[PDB]
Design a protein around this ligand. Structure first.
Ligand SMILES: [Mg+2]
Ligand SMILES: [Mg+2]
Length: 287
DNA sequence: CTGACGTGC
DNA sequence: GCACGTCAG
């Protein structure tokens, strides 16, 4: 037949401590990243200050990306499987810093709208027992003034790492293992750019048949497309943290300044459109 | 929470 | 050969 072997596409599913991915060796980015989060996963003392980005040892160095392709590129290192969903295990969080989970993402988008969607996925664990999330990059076309549709994206670094125009996220949530309740599903596609608090998450929702036709993937193939599957934005709220709750959450976590910056935190919070904190706030214990 | 950035061992 | 206090949104 053909004994020298078929060409290796390199799209083998690679499982880790808490996430699995399929690599795009031509774009140096993942095709899709799948993870499972529960009430137990997001709880833990594993800190991300000990972990830093490094290439995946299992990815062959010919197709692996590196930090040289990201540092001065004007783009951020955006993880698809977030470190916040792996607080229980230091090994699982450390594997999320492999560049086989990273895509070039806008700074404000990574820290803003995409960070709010990741928090909403963690918030769904407070209403569902098991939540599956599929995240990945996209490079969608654009219709020009002459009717011609053209795909165009950017590559950065010596290893041409593709910079996606849009990002997609697929959320599948199960209420309880001991329950006949139907499942909730939602597919969202957001552009890789800074987004404020005006557009709701429902404004970026698309049908699953349209995302599969766009990304060329088939999500959750072991699932039957019966009438049982319900939209996640009807069973749940699909609302992200507004300006108040988000700024209050960030100010609660940034409380470890350990200096006069502690008072500068309430300063920025005070002029931040009148907001107050209910818990124990800056219990300053400074010599 | 999501990022980037510099220096003693 | 590198690896932990600073800062921003
Ligand atoms: Mg990120
Ligand atoms: Mg230390």
């Amino acid at each position: 037949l053909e004994q020298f072997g078929f060409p290796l596409t390199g799209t083998e599913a690679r499982c880790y401590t808490n996430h699995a991915l399929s690599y795009d060796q031509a774009k140096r980015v993942p095709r899709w990243v799948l993870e499972h989060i529960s009430k137990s996963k997001i709880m833990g003392d594993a800190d991300r200050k000990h972990c830093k980005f490094k290439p995946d040892p299992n990815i062959p160095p010919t197709f692996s990306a590196f930090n040289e392709d990201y540092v001065g590129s004007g783009w951020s290192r955006g993880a698809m499987a977030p470190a916040g969903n792996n607080k229980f295990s230091s090994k699982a969080m450390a594997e999320t810093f492999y560049l086989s989970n990273i895509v070039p993402q806008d700074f404000d988008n990574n820290s803003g709208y995409w960070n709010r969607i990741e928090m909403y996925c963690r918030e769904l664990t407070e209403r569902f027992e098991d939540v599956w999330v599929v995240s990945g990059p996209l490079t969608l076309p654009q219709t020009r003034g002459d009717g011609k549709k053209i795909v165009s994206y950017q590559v950065i670094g010596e290893d041409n790492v593709a910079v996606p125009s849009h990002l997609y996220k697929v959320i599948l949530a199960r209420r309880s293992s001991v329950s006949t309740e139907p499942l909730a599903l939602g597919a969202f596609v957001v552009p890789n750019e800074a987004i404020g608090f005006q557009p709701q998450l429902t404004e970026f929702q698309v049908s699953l048949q349209d995302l599969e036709k766009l990304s060329g993937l088939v999500f959750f193939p072991h699932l039957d497309r019966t009438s049982d599957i319900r939209n996640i934005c009807s069973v749940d709220t699909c609302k992200l943290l507004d300006f108040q709750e988000f700024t209050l959450y960030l100010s609660t976590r940034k409380i470890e300044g350990a200096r006069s910056v502690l008072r500068l935190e309430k300063i920025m919070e005070n002029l931040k459109n009148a907001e107050i904190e209910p818990d124990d706030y800056f219990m300053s214990r400074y010599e």
